[PDB]
């Protein structure tokens, strides 16, 4: 369970690990 989160815009600290759908908006599952 690595520190990961879902957001529309992922900064350098959070690399793209996958994709998630929240509130119809396309969220990116980014982690480090």
């Amino acid at each position: 369970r690595r520190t990961c989160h879902c957001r529309s815009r992922c900064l350098r600290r959070e690399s793209n690990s996958g994709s998630c759908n929240i509130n119809g908006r396309i969220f990116s599952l980014c982690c480090r």
Side-chain angles (χ1 to χ4, degrees):
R1 294 265 63 204
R2 296 176 65 87
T3 310
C4 319
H5 186 249
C6 269
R7 55 180 68 184
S8 298
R9 44 180 181 272
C10 291
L11 284 57
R12 63 184 183 197
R13 290 179 292 173
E14 293 82 355
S15 85
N16 62 345
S17 292
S19 185
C20 26
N21 64 89
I22 301 165
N23 295 151
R25 291 178 180 276
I26 309 305
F27 272 42
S28 200
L29 171 55
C30 307
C31 205
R32 184 177 177 86

